[PDB]
Design a protein around this ligand. Sequence first.
Ligand SMILES: [Zn+2]
Ligand SMILES: [Zn+2]
Ligand SMILES: [Zn+2]
Lengths: 339, 339, 339
Amino acid sequence: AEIYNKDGNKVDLYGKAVGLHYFSKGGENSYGGNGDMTYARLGFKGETQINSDLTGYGQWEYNFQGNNSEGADAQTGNKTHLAFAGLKYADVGSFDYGRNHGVVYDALGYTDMLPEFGGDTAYSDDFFVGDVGGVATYRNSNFFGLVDGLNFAVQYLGKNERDTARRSNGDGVGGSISYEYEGFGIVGAYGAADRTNLQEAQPLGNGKKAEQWATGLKYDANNIYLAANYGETRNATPITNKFTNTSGFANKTQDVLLVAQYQFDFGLRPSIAYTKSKAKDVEGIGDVDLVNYFEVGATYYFNKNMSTYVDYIINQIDSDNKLGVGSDDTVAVGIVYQF
Amino acid sequence: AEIYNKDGNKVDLYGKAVGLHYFSKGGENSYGGNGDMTYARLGFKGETQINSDLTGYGQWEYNFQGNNSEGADAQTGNKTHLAFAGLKYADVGSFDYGRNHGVVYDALGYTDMLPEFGGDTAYSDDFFVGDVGGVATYRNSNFFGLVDGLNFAVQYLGKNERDTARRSNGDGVGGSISYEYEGFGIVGAYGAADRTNLQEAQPLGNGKKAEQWATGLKYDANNIYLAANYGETRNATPITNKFTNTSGFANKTQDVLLVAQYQFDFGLRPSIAYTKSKAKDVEGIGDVDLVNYFEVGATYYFNKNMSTYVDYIINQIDSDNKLGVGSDDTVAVGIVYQF
Amino acid sequence: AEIYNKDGNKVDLYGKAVGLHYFSKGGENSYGGNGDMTYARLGFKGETQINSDLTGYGQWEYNFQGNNSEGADAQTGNKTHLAFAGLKYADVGSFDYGRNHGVVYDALGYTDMLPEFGGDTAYSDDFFVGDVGGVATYRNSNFFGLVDGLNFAVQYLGKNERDTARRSNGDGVGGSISYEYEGFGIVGAYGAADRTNLQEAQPLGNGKKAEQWATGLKYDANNIYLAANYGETRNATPITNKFTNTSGFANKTQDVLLVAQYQFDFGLRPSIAYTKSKAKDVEGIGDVDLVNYFEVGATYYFNKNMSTYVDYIINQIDSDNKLGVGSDDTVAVGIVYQF
Ligand SMILES: [Zn+2]
Ligand SMILES: [Zn+2]
Ligand SMILES: [Zn+2]
């Protein structure tokens, strides 16, 4: 919803309301939990034409949880999702700074396409794989205008020293390259950064640096969407040992995400997917699976504004998992109004 | 404020700012407290025409308290009020899911009409009487188009297992019926649901199920508004014993709300009302009044956007109340800008 | 962004997104800290024409921090900044109530003009010098229409009894007078109020009343901005002893703020400034500086919607300060999109 269009500044206000329920057995041992998951989003996006070659922009978006009560748990899950401003110049590129997506999410975005679940390895406040605070990002499209379909990015992750180790990071750099051609895209992305002393001081995870890289292919044409991601992390992936009640990072993970979808004309969009992430060299455990499931789902788009969906996670994690990762299935049902 | 009207999607943005002060003596022993009560609301409402018989909709609304400081108490009282999405079909009815009003509020809404106070028995996160999270609601107007003025609803309350007993509920069903004719409306509504083990485990309240029902009449015509509600609850009404510092639910309550108002042409809207709610079979107390007052107030509407109001609670609760319910009067003064 | 203009009600929606980083050494001993400081604002402003002489208005504005994570620290720094409603009558004046600026901020606003820093003595939840909750404010412009440029205000501060002493206040009155002529403005403002028993009960600060006054001159013309504030506080200024880990108010402070700026045509706006605030008669310390720095900075306005800035604080606080006030420099870099 464009609330402003004058003298080359446009602002859009946008938002959505997501009625959502998760169904698991009893669901502390399930993939996604059990119960009401309703939530809403609000945000704006602005773009100003400063001169013929130079445009400025900003975006903000907030998540309000709607599955809390009015009492002490009222703001649980609320958060800024995005908040950044930048400048884009004719064929030089663009620069922005704020709370934005890590550059490795340029690869991991390929498979983050399921109705409700998926994108399990694109953690937030996790260096370069998801939403992080304090990233400057340089981006270039069509390689300075010289090569159509050829994009690249370089990102400086600023150190965030937070109270918990799970949410902290040190100084870091990363980058990405994508090519897109006749329906297809290929991408690679990499980032490395310091761990904070508090992260170091965790039982799980040993190393002075964190590292995350991923590659991906996708096909997005003829009503079809197909993608594959492969990824590898060192000292970077957050883990918890539910038996010993300890927390930290996986010394190494190996990540596979695959997704296949088809979009019917009349709005039905079936989906199948697979996610496996394996931890290795975990203090006191050795090797252990973090995520391992198949997904079957569908979204029904009535139009640009309304949709319903059901998302089934056939959970292949096993009951005797060494970290306590939950092994039960989850089904999500959702109804979305957005503008 | 309609920010979007195109191709049969309309979105409204709305909000208000409420400068508000409560005056009691000293006010921990008063009906409504003492001091600044300013707050603001923001929300949107969307409606999309999917086809000729089928419309989709969503609503979200947030409460920001404006009587906090910037420090540790900054978000106290903030909360999602509403957050839901649904579909309405030609003369079949409508379905929605999210954070919405309990179906018993279809009756209790009749008297929830005072400038500032009132609606004392339409508690939030209290099964079916007020705002609750995780309700699916089916609604039918004019009985499938067959009977003008005859409405009904059926609601499935999903279990919310929360950290506190005050805010939790189990699985539940409920419904309502209203008829509206030549200025008048009559209504009845009922709901029953499981109590969670944590609720069971409270000192106050004993029972495996919660139950809430109410009936009401109103007259809304010729500048007059008159309504009466009668209600009864079992194991459902939240109570606290301020002497023993314990909390739980009333085994039984009996509820009476009456309201009379007149709307002058030139914007003055005087009000009188009465609320009595009696607890029974309360562990360690037996019978005790929860709410017992008369109200005298007025709102001055300058127009659709601006109003002032004063709301006086002559508090009939007595100084020796057995639960510690406050017995002092309260006066609220308010100025409202809304859009 | 005006989202509504009809029948003499107008509403504006506004907001901004501030990508911001602070650079200090290591930065617990610095002026402004170290790291990501991104944040966003959203608000509305409404004005309704009730009749030819009487207009009603409301404003609300929220601060969302964008330099938090999604976990336990997600809402840190979030707060209502403003939230009030009122009425303005032809040449009688205006009245409003809510969370608004203390009347002494009518003087202190003169120098609160730096890119990022400054306004150091206009604390929030501090009686009359900054944002406070529960103020009624009467305002008059051009002295009932009789004297152009001559404005005055009187403000009733309502008691806020909060959990902490830092954020509380008692009942209070205050006022201000300004004259504005041929480019210049002069102003004086004063307020006094009760301290709460909890404030009294603090180690730092002794007195039954709080008092704050300030005067100011400014010049705002020919692309130049120059201002000076002088201020004095008794029992009102919040202080902490980082050595003894105690908190309270300064028995007396003396405050000086000066600012000089020039606005180039092509959008560059250099700045220099000075702030000194001295505490006196501080229990266990005697006299000690709270703030003492020089500022050098600049903002580049690309247009009404986009700007960049850099703000350097040459910190003159000394390493051996008796309260533990940080003595290191800070540099802020910022990029702003606003609408
Ligand atoms: Zn994201
Ligand atoms: Zn409600
Ligand atoms: Zn302010």
